[PDB]
Design a protein around this ligand. Structure first.
Ligand SMILES: Nc1ncnc2c1ncn2[C@@H]1O[C@H](COP(=O)(O)OP(=O)(O)O)[C@@H](O)[C@H]1O
Ligand SMILES: Nc1ncnc2c1ncn2[C@@H]1O[C@H](COP(=O)(O)OP(=O)(O)O)[C@@H](O)[C@H]1O
Ligand SMILES: Nc1ncnc2c1ncn2[C@@H]1O[C@H](COP(=O)(O)OP(=O)(O)O)[C@@H](O)[C@H]1O
Ligand SMILES: Nc1ncnc2c1ncn2[C@@H]1O[C@H](COP(=O)(O)OP(=O)(O)O)[C@@H](O)[C@H]1O
Ligand SMILES: [Mg+2]
Ligand SMILES: [Mg+2]
Ligand SMILES: [Mg+2]
Ligand SMILES: [Mg+2]
Ligand SMILES: [Mg+2]
Ligand SMILES: [Mg+2]
Ligand SMILES: [Mg+2]
Ligand SMILES: [Mg+2]
Ligand SMILES: [Mg+2]
Ligand SMILES: [Mg+2]
Lengths: 254, 254, 254, 254
């Protein structure tokens, strides 16, 4: 447990990259709550990446909220490569025929053929599968991916299901399956200045620190004096830290 | 997630049994903190037992603190049998030769013989094992167990280690091993009006609810009116509930 | 390891019990096969029972083949509790919607309420699960189990399905799910002179000895002695034993 | 399953590479055994390589026995990536404190600092772990690996130890720990015409075909053809194939 202290750091805001598109309603809600509370409940989870920088793997909305509220440093928890894995979320639309984004005039080259290579995107109903193969796309595969996801994401009662799960579709479900990305692929996206669609990458992260409740007043100055105050704050919080190994239901309110 | 609401209940204090001895310093600390905060951070974890009663499986000190502070009902989380298992803690004394409770005049019938039956208690050092066999004890096995545990528990820098763990002892460690109890054995202890020693039973519990922060003012009346207020409180808290599946480090302070 | 050698024993046929009804079609082919070969390829797997008897946990048809062939002694491997577990086979009726023996059961008290207590039997179709809870049974739990299984086993195509299988039922499927028995419960069936329905219990056994190839002649004339020959035989075979740990596909011919 | 049948193939000896140095004592006994029997009991397990070649992942000594015996063709089973994993064997030197080749290594830059990056090699005694980090190496990582292993393999008693083993070192033990290689890395060694030190790589392979017993005569005169005989042979053997899933002890004689 005595290593967590070392992973909780204040990082300059300009050193942090995002790889995932934000959700506008989620950002408004996160920003309003941070502004009201003037604390950050959970530190932003980051991994070290190229060029001395840090990449958010959990906390896009918290990060953007803190930035907009004028924070010059971000409370992060630095996650080591051995303590996370990357999977994907499948997206279950519980009544596809009432999902306007899916019943629209279709323009992409969906096909039912199974090929030797893995499909870029798979759309499933109870009886059939349609595929998009990377080899058939003209637009940047990233722009096609985002168009597909955003067509139904805010409007069709989507339920995210772990890509590894066992799921049986009823007679009107649609299931969207996406391929898991490796960390190197995500870094190439960031290097290009791009982001992946929201709610598709699924980081499984061991050892997250919760309920740190960092007061925003520690985050407004890029320089020091605040570092002694940060250490004092952290020492006090770590005194009350406890570890839980099984599944937990955390009440996130005061 | 929508089942947790049903498991969080206010139970009359007189319907709740303990099976484990409290630690006096731990009780003082828990009671002081509850009194200062006038909230219960985490609900007491209980299992249904015989006679319409409930048995604490986590929260002896919280329970006794609430009782002493005048609570007539206890916020519990009812844990189902399929969501916990019972193991044991081994107790590592990091310098046994400086542990007065272990270097005392010895009176129990320790033996190095390995027998066909399982030992009641095992004391290990780096090279040797000594056993206490239930078949050799005169005193109630429970009273012998408590004498052994309390001889070193508060004084010899004990480190609790999961009975299933891999541990290598250095040249001065002592390791005390205790047998896991089954739920039926624990219930027989309670039926006798007895308790097992502190810090030996190890419940592994899936799905615990944390940071509920129940205000003590909801707990002082055995009758109702408070039940509508309990439902309103619970509805608000459950709105902010989130599930975490991997290991977490929870900061337990405000 | 020499521990294995000691578990390979010749047991009087009269001391061996079955817990599972046999299939005569499988019995004829097993008997035929053993008769042609004059060797028992794989020893019967048994567990030690009360009264000094043994219970077959794998080898119902081998046992009765040898028994029917006049063997006074059975080559067994004695399995310890630590090296096996008891699961269950599900039963899929792919045309169950047309299975007469199943759709006319007006007498048994099936129900759809999910209770806190595990159900005795579960019957699933594409959109409904029905449950038999032990607390509602009108007659002996075993004879009810038997009646359910036989209502479709003899008049409807069936295939076993493992618990791990992710199976999505189509419009005419029925899936029967049975609760796994503990070892104590199976010992009860056998001591009432009975058996469980065939094809339901699933024993997961580690460390089976394969390809011992015991000549049948060792299994008769026990009244003259056979221990000398047996150990002479075992020592020669044991020397070529090799341990394999993952899933294997064994070619069983020469 | 018929998928297995298709993975059992006769491969020209010239298209098969080894990744591991052999032991001549084990080679003589393997050759002797195959020569006496005139059958290859278990097929060589290989993976498809670049350029259309194959790499042995189990069967270094069987391959070279057949090769030394003049076989122009090798009976292999082609293993897919999904059915194996690459681990490592630890090396225990029970009298390592007196192992001269190990206690005089003044040249290699061992270090005790634990860094965020996994180490290349780890050397353990009862109270100290020393590490070789790839970023400190003076020469080729493979030749350093080789030098370390050979410093004790030829002049000190050694026994392999599995990763899962809970091992407490005594006063004179030394334990060497090696980092598991990925498949890409082993392919590199072979394409540089080299091998890794013996007894370190640990392949966990699921679905091995056992007891095929391929007659040696099928493996010569390939210049006249052998596909007809091969399939005739496989169809007869495949019909007696049986799948076993847990640990088995196979008697390998008739
Ligand atoms: N879990 C879900 O995933 C979404 C992720 O956003 P959230 O965790 O709230 O913010 P952040 O982007 O700061 O992690 C939430 O809307 C929540 O409902
Ligand atoms: N974990 C440890 O186990 C002990 C259990 O007591 P605690 O969880 O604080 O109170 P409760 O008895 O209310 O669960 C604590 O002293 C803590 O240090
Ligand atoms: N008729 C048979 N022909 C060939 N092998 C058989 C036959 N019956 C049994 N066996 C061998 O015994 C093993 C298990 O047989 P099984 O059908 O379970 O009968 P039992 O009831 O004796 O276990 C099989 O893996 C097979 O190798
Ligand atoms: N000398 C031998 N005698 C008997 N069986 C052998 C011999 N060599 C190899 N085998 C068979 O091959 C299997 C693996 O042999 P192994 O020692 O790993 O050599 P290889 O390098 O060919 O894998 C063993 O399980 C054994 O059944
Ligand atoms: Mg998040
Ligand atoms: Mg639907
Ligand atoms: Mg559309
Ligand atoms: Mg506790
Ligand atoms: Mg010590
Ligand atoms: Mg004492
Ligand atoms: Mg069987
Ligand atoms: Mg069907
Ligand atoms: Mg080998
Ligand atoms: Mg030693």
């Amino acid at each position: 447990m005595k290593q967590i202290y070392d992973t909780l750091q204040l990082i300059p805001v300009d050193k942090i990259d995002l790889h995932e598109a934000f959700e506008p309603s989620r950002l408004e809600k996160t920003k309003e709550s941070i502004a009201k509370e003037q604390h950050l409940r959970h530190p932003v989870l980051v991994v070290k990446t190229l060029f001395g920088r840090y990449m958010v793997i959990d906390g896009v909305h918290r990060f953007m909220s803190l930035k907009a509220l004028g924070c010059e440093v971000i409370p992060v928890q630095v996650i080591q490569r051995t303590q996370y894995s990357i999977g994907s979320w499948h997206h279950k639309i519980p009544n596809g025929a009432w999902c306007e984004g899916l019943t629209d005039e279709e323009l992409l080259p969906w096909t039912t053929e199974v090929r030797d290579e893995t499909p870029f995107i798979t759309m499933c109903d109870q009886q059939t599968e349609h595929y998009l193969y990377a080899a058939d796309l003209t637009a940047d595969k990233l722009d096609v991916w985002k168009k597909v996801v955003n067509s139904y994401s805010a409007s069709c009662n989507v339920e995210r299901v772990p890509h590894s799960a066992c799921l049986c579709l009823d007679s009107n479900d649609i299931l969207m399956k996406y391929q898991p990305l490796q960390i190197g692929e995500i870094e190439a996206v960031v290097q290009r200045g791009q982001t992946v669609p929201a709610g598709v990458t699924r980081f499984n992260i061991a050892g997250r620190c919760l309920n740190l409740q960092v007061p925003l007043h520690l985050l407004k100055n890029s320089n020091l004096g605040n570092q002694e105050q940060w250490h004092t704050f952290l020492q006090k919080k770590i005194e009350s830290m406890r570890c839980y190994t099984e599944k937990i239901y955390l009440i996130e309110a005061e």
